[PDB]
Amino acid sequence: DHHMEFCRVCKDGGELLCCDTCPSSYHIHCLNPPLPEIPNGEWLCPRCTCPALKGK
């Protein structure tokens, strides 16, 4: 596998949402909008979901 073996939030290795763009691992409830189940399609972690790079 190519992402963390536990939720970056909990350090718990439950069902971890494999960020489609990066090796970040989270529980669907350790996100901003908690999910009742793993999303359909391209899911990105909070780290990847920032469109505006705050260079300043």
Binding site: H3, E5, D12, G13, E15, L17, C18, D20
Partner: peptide
């Protein structure tokens, strides 16, 4: 969206 299941802190 993908998911892994490894070592969650149940034990």
């Amino acid at each position: 969206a993908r998911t892994k299941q490894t070592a969650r802190k149940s034990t």
